[PDB]
Design a binder for this molecule. Sequence first.
Ligand SMILES: CN(C)[C@@H]1C(O)=C(C(N)=O)C(=O)[C@@]2(O)C(O)=C3C(=O)c4c(O)ccc(I)c4C[C@H]3C[C@@H]12
Ligand SMILES: CN(C)[C@@H]1C(O)=C(C(N)=O)C(=O)[C@@]2(O)C(O)=C3C(=O)c4c(O)ccc(I)c4C[C@H]3C[C@@H]12
Ligand SMILES: [Cl-]
Ligand SMILES: [Cl-]
Ligand SMILES: [Mg+2]
Ligand SMILES: [Mg+2]
Lengths: 207, 207
Amino acid sequence: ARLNRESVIDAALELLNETGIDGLTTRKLAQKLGIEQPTLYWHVKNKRALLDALAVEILARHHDYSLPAAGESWQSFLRNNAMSFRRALLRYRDGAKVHLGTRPDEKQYDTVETQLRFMTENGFSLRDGLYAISAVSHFTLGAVLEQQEHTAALTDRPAAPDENLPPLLREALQIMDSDDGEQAFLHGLESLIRGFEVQLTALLQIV
Amino acid sequence: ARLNRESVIDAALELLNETGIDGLTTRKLAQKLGIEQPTLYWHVKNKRALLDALAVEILARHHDYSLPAAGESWQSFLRNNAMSFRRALLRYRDGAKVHLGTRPDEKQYDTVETQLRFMTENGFSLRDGLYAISAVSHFTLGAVLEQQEHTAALTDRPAAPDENLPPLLREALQIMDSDDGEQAFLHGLESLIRGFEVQLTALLQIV
Ligand SMILES: CN(C)[C@@H]1C(O)=C(C(N)=O)C(=O)[C@@]2(O)C(O)=C3C(=O)c4c(O)ccc(I)c4C[C@H]3C[C@@H]12
Ligand SMILES: CN(C)[C@@H]1C(O)=C(C(N)=O)C(=O)[C@@]2(O)C(O)=C3C(=O)c4c(O)ccc(I)c4C[C@H]3C[C@@H]12
Ligand SMILES: [Cl-]
Ligand SMILES: [Cl-]
Ligand SMILES: [Mg+2]
Ligand SMILES: [Mg+2]
């Protein structure tokens, strides 16, 4: 096996889709690369180092709407950015789980700084811009986590035995699983954005 | 050790706060109860069975705003219910993680049915009521997950070495960690609720 950074992460990503985040072991990574663990240890000191790098690479490779277009409204950038973040989290098994608990990396500083600055130039205080970004981020992670983990868990349950399901819930779940949760996410996303807009344009009035 | 259902779950909860969800093993649970694994196996067939029961018990014990008060508005119930859900997720280590991927349990059917019905009697279609509930749920899980996992991870990082932190981000993170993320959550929560309200009261008008 070739053992530069890009080769290690490629292989770690393959493994993540075979085994999930819980089977992403240094031991199994070494098997994958056909090397002995101490060779691996020279390049990758532990699982956390690895999870952090993966979190960053996942977005670097598949998160393509991280900056606003020229003249694009804040409402639009936030929608496009959340969509882009979702596709990215979703391209790998337990990908949301891999992002969880990370904070921005040095390679991401410039990008996140621009996002923050961009909100502030649209009339958000830093505090409110921070909250809008966080809310979008938290909402999108939760939706993707519930979706991916429910699909993981699907294999180990007796699965909604119905009959004794009451009527609304019964119809609710049929609807929730009509699709991957995209409609639900997209509808919620609009609610969030609109809600921030009425806050912004309230200024110092009571809303 | 006493080995009824309530004793097993009590002990599993103690363990969850000592070891986290990843160290919640049947092996370690048996140690905790001072019994041999086959004795445990008679009562608790595996980790998933256990995680499911825990998810339900956590809410049964600490989620006290699961139904609307008499005459309470939908906006109010959703705020109170999300707050109540958050405190609950947060009372145990990796408690959000334990909830993840669960779906409503038989013991919860009646409660969730009422929530659904209640939205529909306030003018939501089932579909829109479902989305509002889901959005609140997903948002609250994400916020709590990021908070709990960042705190877990805190122990294993070199921790924001600053200096080369750019100014807005730098001030952003000071703000994000001024508190446990409560302000951010509460502010986002209002945005979500208000956004649903403008949707509701749009009816068939363009908004
Ligand atoms: C989802 N989208 C709003 C953002 C985004 O586009 C990026 C990215 N890398 O391009 C991200 O890194 C992002 O997904 C993301 O992960 C973010 C955070 O993790 C984060 C944080 O944890 C604490 C403070 C701040 I301040 C942030 C910035 C947030 C920005 C998030
Ligand atoms: C957070 N709050 C809106 C709700 C709640 O009060 C309860 C509860 N048990 O009282 C819950 O169980 C809840 O937390 C919760 O966990 C829910 C779900 O998991 C859920 C779902 O996964 C798929 C369809 C539906 I339809 C639901 C109902 C949602 C209701 C959520
Ligand atoms: Cl090499
Ligand atoms: Cl007993
Ligand atoms: Mg993040
Ligand atoms: Mg749930």
